[PDB]
């Protein structure tokens, strides 16, 4: 429902990098030229922001106590 | 035996006995659901 | 002779050709670095308040998979039995906002998130989120919270392009776009493979008779990053010391049978 | 000779015996189960149980 | 293939016999060692399946060869109990010895089992019917002249 | 690690190394099958699952030297190999 | 791997892939009978009949109802609640609880107080369980492909491409030319080259991306038009000899989980008339 932390397969650390990238990529700037600024060489990193989905904004509207 | 309990809709401290009462319900609206709160005893998770 | 050749060096990553050694060596330094080498992981959460969207398992595992640092001077990194000293993580936090990895507080100064900007879970008005966690070393190959990076090698190799090819042209721009040292000699263009280097769709006839290959023998380009826990020549020396420590035990115990 | 339907009449007979508290015909390695007596006795020979044909 | 199951869901019950005389006769009636010809036909019913018979092909198929260190290891992890490696086939350039498929192959066989026949890959004849010819004239042809006339 | 004998004879020798893996099982044994007198040497893991943290060693000689002592050799020949690379690193890096 | 079993990383299972929560709901009335008579939400007392083991009630509320967030194995008591006693005995209270099923485990996550349509007191509460992979559990594809997962591979155990790519699933070949799936290849392709060009590729039946387009796009990106990888093997440390086809493919986990489906009975209850085993895993 979040961005998830790690890559799933070789465990780099890419929680941090995702609004950035969608900030970026909203702007104008190319995709892929934005994800090789970030660093994401591995298409394996690069599938988990690509294809990411922020669903955490759409069930927080529901509370339980 | 008293407890307390959160309303469904507005969130609210509801306090009632359920074995006595007759009429379940919110004082604040009419909700007739309400939460069981979670107890603030400290609870241990595995981070597996 | 055995003889370390840095190519490549940046804040997380060390890019070095290996020389002398069998592959059996090389793998098992690779699987050492990738499973044995600790480091400092979340692995007991203990929640007193908890009322965001998330269930307390899934907070657990995110906690449990942001790298924290690790000092090296404090403890025996290369014992084959490690210490059971634990370091304590507490948070807390209320209201509207995005709860980050630098919002959490350390009782060691020297263990504490590596990256501060990591989010954890969103908070909306009226939500509560208090909790302590402990941190404990562990080991690569029991949990892949506990690895400290990601390796990964191949064979050294020149790939030998004939000038015989009636447009080896393209395929030396085409290496020298790929930024692989390319040394031009007669008839021959030489092409070291620093970095996988696939022929195209077009050259591929040319292949093996013509396009042939050569892997040096005892030789290998490591690749070694980090995510921050610690330094990459840390982490091989490590390793490395690890390798020596466990055939020492083997000769140990080993004797034990005379 | 024996036919399968014979050998496993008579081993399933010898086990139940050696169950039910009959003694071991032959020296066996401890720890061994009644079912595997009774096949180690019967492959070793020593059957004490014969089967009526007409 | 006796249970006519693939592992995609599929689930399958299992029976523990109460009784000494069930489990005799589970035992020696129904072990999966007696069951391996079928009744329907008098033909294997258990057999190698896929990959077996994949690797089958490419280890004994021709051009296939080995190292030391891959020998040892496949030998070793076969089960096979063997405590001295047989002689190289052929020798590799830079002195390495190198086994051919059919050796090692030959290891995981009864000691005098005989048997010719024509398999799913026969496409030209003639090589066939010439190692044919060779066995019928003779029936124990010298193995290097067998060798010359191999074919898959 | 433990040693655990399975069997042996006048030059063999079969034992479990209990607490291991592929690890530093493929680079002993790749070690052993330097020494010339070492006639078959290989290991395996009986089980993925259950033996995981047993593999099983097999270990035969020309009766030159004693299997126990073609181990302890390869298990120097490491340790020496590991302290030089360990050296060159050290002097490299820095 | 082999019957259309798949392979998969054990580091990436630790990681959070196709790790899942499932959900059940319990239900408990407050009966109203007929003369007066009613249940009650309480504690059961050892004197009424029909009370099981202490060890069961550890987790109940002075109401009646269990905590929210308390763990909870097989059969633990849920609600609390006696009934009338039966004519066959007399001044007792039969023991009415309801428990989780006598296989299932998980974490107690809401309870709802509520009233129903007679004004009698209705409670609803959900367990919820984490269900990491294991083995048995089932994994298909769009493509019609499907199975179940054989093996858990420790990371290093797997290969690695040249290029640094280790397989989060690994999948038997032998299925393929049977089954005649030529567009799960294709979207094998179609996957890393979009997860490669930083965008995605579509995939609309007859108007979709050609495979002819893909095939250069990925040469264009400096990898082999085949889609074909050298990688080495995780255990000896050398390059396999033939080049192995690697991607990115979609794949689904279904909630045919070995968790729902084990089940084993020792001796069990028996039915009334033919005095044989019941029917079903929940009883
Ligand atoms: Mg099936
Ligand atoms: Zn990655
Ligand atoms: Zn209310």
């Given at each position: 429902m979040i961005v998830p932390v790690r890559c799933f397969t070789c465990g780099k650390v890419i929680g941090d990098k995702y609004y950035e990238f969608k900030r970026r990529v909203e702007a104008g700037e190319d995709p892929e030229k934005v994800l090789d600024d970030l660093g994401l060489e591995r298409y394996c990193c690069r599938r988990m922001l690509l294809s990411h989905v922020e669903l955490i904004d759409d069930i927080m509207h529901y509370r339980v106590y | 035996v008293e407890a307390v309990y959160r309303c469904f809709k507005c969130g609210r401290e509801v306090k009632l006995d359920l074995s006595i009462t007759r009429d379940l319900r919110c004082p604040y609206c009419g909700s007739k659901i309400l939460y069981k709160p979670r107890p603030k005893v400290p609870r241990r998770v595995k981070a597996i | 002779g055995i003889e370390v050749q840095i190519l490549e060096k940046k804040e997380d990553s060390i890019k070095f050709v290996l020389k002398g050694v069998h592959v059996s060596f090389a793998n098992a330094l690779r699987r050492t670095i990738l499973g044995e080498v600790p480091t400092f992981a979340v692995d007991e959460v203990e929640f007193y308040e908890n009322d965001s969207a998330l269930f307390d398992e899934i907070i657990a595992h995110r906690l449990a998979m942001i790298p924290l640092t690790t000092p090296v001077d404090r403890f025996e990194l290369d014992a084959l039995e490690l210490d059971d000293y634990t370091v304590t993580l507490s948070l807390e936090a209320e209201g509207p906002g995005i709860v980050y990895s630098g919002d959490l507080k350390s009782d060691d100064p020297d263990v504490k998130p590596v990256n501060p900007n990591i989010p954890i879970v969103k908070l909306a008005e009226g939500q509560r989120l208090v909790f302590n966690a402990y941190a404990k070393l562990g080991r690569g190959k029991d949990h892949?919270?506990?690895?400290?990076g990601f390796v990964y090698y191949k064979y050294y190799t020149i790939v030998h392009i004939s000038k015989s090819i009636p447009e080896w042209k393209e395929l030396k721009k085409l290496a020298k776009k790929r930024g692989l040292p390319v040394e031009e000699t007669e008839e021959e263009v030489l092409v070291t493979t620093i970095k996988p280097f696939y022929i195209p769709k077009d050259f591929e006839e040319y292949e093996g008779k013509e396009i042939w290959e050569e892997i040096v023998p005892n030789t290998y380009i490591f690749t070694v990053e980090t995510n921050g826990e610690l330094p990459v020549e840390e982490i091989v020396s490590i390793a490395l010391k690890i390798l020596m420590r466990k055939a020492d035990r083997f000769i140990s115990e080993l004797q034990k049978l005379t | 000779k024996y036919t399968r339907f014979e050998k496993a009449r008579i081993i399933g007979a010898r086990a139940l015996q050696i169950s039910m508290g009959a003694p071991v015909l032959i020296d066996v390695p401890p720890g061994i189960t009644p079912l595997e007596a009774a096949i180690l006795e019967f492959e070793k020979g020593v059957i004490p149980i014969t089967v009526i044909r007409p | 293939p006796p249970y006519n199951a693939d592992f995609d869901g599929d689930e399958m019950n299992l029976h523990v016999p109460q009784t000494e005389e069930a489990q005799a006769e589970a035992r020696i009636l129904m072990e999966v060692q007696n069951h391996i010809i079928s009744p329907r036909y008098g033909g294997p019913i258990i057999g190698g399946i896929q990959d077996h018979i994949s690797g089958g092909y490419l280890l004994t198929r021709e051009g296939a060869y080995f190292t030391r260190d891959e020998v040892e290891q496949m030998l070793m992890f076969a089960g096979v109990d063997i405590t001295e490696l047989p002689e190289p086939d052929k020798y590799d350039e830079n002195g390495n010895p190198l086994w051919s498929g059919k050796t090692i192959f030959s290891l995981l066989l009864p000691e005098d089992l005989t048997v010719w026949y024509r398999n799913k890959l026969c496409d030209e004849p003639e090589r066939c019917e010439a190692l044919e010819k060779l066995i019928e004239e003779k029936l124990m042809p010298d193995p290097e002249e067998v060798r010359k006339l191999a074919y898959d | 690690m433990k040693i655990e004998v399975i069997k042996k004879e006048e030059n063999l020798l079969e034992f479990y190394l209990e607490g291991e893996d592929h690890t530093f099982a493929n680079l002993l044994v790749e070690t052993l099958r330097e020494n010339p007198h070492v006639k078959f040497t290989a290991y395996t893991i009986e089980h993925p699952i259950t033996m995981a943290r047993k593999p099983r060693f097999r270990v035969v000689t020309d009766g030159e030297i004693t299997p126990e002592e073609a181990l302890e050799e390869a298990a120097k020949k490491i340790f020496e190999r590991a302290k030089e690379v360990l050296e060159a690193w050290e002097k490299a890096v820095k | 791997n082999m019957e259309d079993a798949i392979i998969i990383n054990k580091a990436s299972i630790e990681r959070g892939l196709a790790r899942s929560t499932f959900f059940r709901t319990y239900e408990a009335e407050e009966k109203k009978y007929l003369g007066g008579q009613t249940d009650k939400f309480e504690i059961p007392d050892p004197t009424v009949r029909g009370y099981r083991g202490e060890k069961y009630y550890r987790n109940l509320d002075e109401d009646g109802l269990i905590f929210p967030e308390s763990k909870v194995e097989g059969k633990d008591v849920l609600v609390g609640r006696t009934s009338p006693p039966r004519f066959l005995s007399l001044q007792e209270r039969r023991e009415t609880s309801v428990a989780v099923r006598p296989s299932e485990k998980g974490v107690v996550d809401k309870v709802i107080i509520t009233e129903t349509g007679d004004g009698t007191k209705l409670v609803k509460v959900t367990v919820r369980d984490l269900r990491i992979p294991e083995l048995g559990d089932k994994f298909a594809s769009r493509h019609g492909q499907k199975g179940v997962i054989g093996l858990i591979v420790p990371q290093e155990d797997m290969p690695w491409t040249e290029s640094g790519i280790v397989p989060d699933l690994i999948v038997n070949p032998h299925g393929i030319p049977s089954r005649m799936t030529v567009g799960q290849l294709i979207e094998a392709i179609g996957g890393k080259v979009a997860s490669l060009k930083g965008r995605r590729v579509d995939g609309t039946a007859f108007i979709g991306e050609p495979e002819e387009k893909l095939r250069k796009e990925l040469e264009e990106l400096g990898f082999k038009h085949t889609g074909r990888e050298i990688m080495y093997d995780g255990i000896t440390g050398k390059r396999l000899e033939a080049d192995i086809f690697i991607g990115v493919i979609y794949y689904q986990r279904l909630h045919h989980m070995v968790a729902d489906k084990i089940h084993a009975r020792s001796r069990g209850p028996v039915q009334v008339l033919t005095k044989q085993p019941t029917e079903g895993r929940a009883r």
């Amino acid at each position: 429902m979040i961005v998830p932390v790690r890559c799933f397969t070789c465990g780099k650390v890419i929680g941090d990098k995702y609004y950035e990238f969608k900030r970026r990529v909203e702007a104008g700037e190319d995709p892929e030229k934005v994800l090789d600024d970030l660093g994401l060489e591995r298409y394996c990193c690069r599938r988990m922001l690509l294809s990411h989905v922020e669903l955490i904004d759409d069930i927080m509207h529901y509370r339980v106590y | 035996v008293e407890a307390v309990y959160r309303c469904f809709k507005c969130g609210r401290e509801v306090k009632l006995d359920l074995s006595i009462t007759r009429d379940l319900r919110c004082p604040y609206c009419g909700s007739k659901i309400l939460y069981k709160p979670r107890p603030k005893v400290p609870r241990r998770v595995k981070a597996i | 002779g055995i003889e370390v050749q840095i190519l490549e060096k940046k804040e997380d990553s060390i890019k070095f050709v290996l020389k002398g050694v069998h592959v059996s060596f090389a793998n098992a330094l690779r699987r050492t670095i990738l499973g044995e080498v600790p480091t400092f992981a979340v692995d007991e959460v203990e929640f007193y308040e908890n009322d965001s969207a998330l269930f307390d398992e899934i907070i657990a595992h995110r906690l449990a998979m942001i790298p924290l640092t690790t000092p090296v001077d404090r403890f025996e990194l290369d014992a084959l039995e490690l210490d059971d000293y634990t370091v304590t993580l507490s948070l807390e936090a209320e209201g509207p906002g995005i709860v980050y990895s630098g919002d959490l507080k350390s009782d060691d100064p020297d263990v504490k998130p590596v990256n501060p900007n990591i989010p954890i879970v969103k908070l909306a008005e009226g939500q509560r989120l208090v909790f302590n966690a402990y941190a404990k070393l562990g080991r690569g190959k029991d949990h892949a919270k506990w690895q400290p990076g990601f390796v990964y090698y191949k064979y050294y190799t020149i790939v030998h392009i004939s000038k015989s090819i009636p447009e080896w042209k393209e395929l030396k721009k085409l290496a020298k776009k790929r930024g692989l040292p390319v040394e031009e000699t007669e008839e021959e263009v030489l092409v070291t493979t620093i970095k996988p280097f696939y022929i195209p769709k077009d050259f591929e006839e040319y292949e093996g008779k013509e396009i042939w290959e050569e892997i040096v023998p005892n030789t290998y380009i490591f690749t070694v990053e980090t995510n921050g826990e610690l330094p990459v020549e840390e982490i091989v020396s490590i390793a490395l010391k690890i390798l020596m420590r466990k055939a020492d035990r083997f000769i140990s115990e080993l004797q034990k049978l005379t | 000779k024996y036919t399968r339907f014979e050998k496993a009449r008579i081993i399933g007979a010898r086990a139940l015996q050696i169950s039910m508290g009959a003694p071991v015909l032959i020296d066996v390695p401890p720890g061994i189960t009644p079912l595997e007596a009774a096949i180690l006795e019967f492959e070793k020979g020593v059957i004490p149980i014969t089967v009526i044909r007409p | 293939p006796p249970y006519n199951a693939d592992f995609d869901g599929d689930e399958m019950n299992l029976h523990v016999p109460q009784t000494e005389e069930a489990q005799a006769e589970a035992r020696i009636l129904m072990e999966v060692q007696n069951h391996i010809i079928s009744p329907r036909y008098g033909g294997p019913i258990i057999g190698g399946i896929q990959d077996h018979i994949s690797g089958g092909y490419l280890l004994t198929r021709e051009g296939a060869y080995f190292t030391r260190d891959e020998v040892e290891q496949m030998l070793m992890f076969a089960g096979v109990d063997i405590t001295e490696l047989p002689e190289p086939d052929k020798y590799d350039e830079n002195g390495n010895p190198l086994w051919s498929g059919k050796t090692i192959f030959s290891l995981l066989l009864p000691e005098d089992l005989t048997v010719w026949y024509r398999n799913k890959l026969c496409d030209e004849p003639e090589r066939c019917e010439a190692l044919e010819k060779l066995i019928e004239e003779k029936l124990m042809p010298d193995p290097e002249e067998v060798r010359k006339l191999a074919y898959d | 690690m433990k040693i655990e004998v399975i069997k042996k004879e006048e030059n063999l020798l079969e034992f479990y190394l209990e607490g291991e893996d592929h690890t530093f099982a493929n680079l002993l044994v790749e070690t052993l099958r330097e020494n010339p007198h070492v006639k078959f040497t290989a290991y395996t893991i009986e089980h993925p699952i259950t033996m995981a943290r047993k593999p099983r060693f097999r270990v035969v000689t020309d009766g030159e030297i004693t299997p126990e002592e073609a181990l302890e050799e390869a298990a120097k020949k490491i340790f020496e190999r590991a302290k030089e690379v360990l050296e060159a690193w050290e002097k490299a890096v820095k | 791997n082999m019957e259309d079993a798949i392979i998969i990383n054990k580091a990436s299972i630790e990681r959070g892939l196709a790790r899942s929560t499932f959900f059940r709901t319990y239900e408990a009335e407050e009966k109203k009978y007929l003369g007066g008579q009613t249940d009650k939400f309480e504690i059961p007392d050892p004197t009424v009949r029909g009370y099981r083991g202490e060890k069961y009630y550890r987790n109940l509320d002075e109401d009646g109802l269990i905590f929210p967030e308390s763990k909870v194995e097989g059969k633990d008591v849920l609600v609390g609640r006696t009934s009338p006693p039966r004519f066959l005995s007399l001044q007792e209270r039969r023991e009415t609880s309801v428990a989780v099923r006598p296989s299932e485990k998980g974490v107690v996550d809401k309870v709802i107080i509520t009233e129903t349509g007679d004004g009698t007191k209705l409670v609803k509460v959900t367990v919820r369980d984490l269900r990491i992979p294991e083995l048995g559990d089932k994994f298909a594809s769009r493509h019609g492909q499907k199975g179940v997962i054989g093996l858990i591979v420790p990371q290093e155990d797997m290969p690695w491409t040249e290029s640094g790519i280790v397989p989060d699933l690994i999948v038997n070949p032998h299925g393929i030319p049977s089954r005649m799936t030529v567009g799960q290849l294709i979207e094998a392709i179609g996957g890393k080259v979009a997860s490669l060009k930083g965008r995605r590729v579509d995939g609309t039946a007859f108007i979709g991306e050609p495979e002819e387009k893909l095939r250069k796009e990925l040469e264009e990106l400096g990898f082999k038009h085949t889609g074909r990888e050298i990688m080495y093997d995780g255990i000896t440390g050398k390059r396999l000899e033939a080049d192995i086809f690697i991607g990115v493919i979609y794949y689904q986990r279904l909630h045919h989980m070995v968790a729902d489906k084990i089940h084993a009975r020792s001796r069990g209850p028996v039915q009334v008339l033919t005095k044989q085993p019941t029917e079903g895993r929940a009883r």
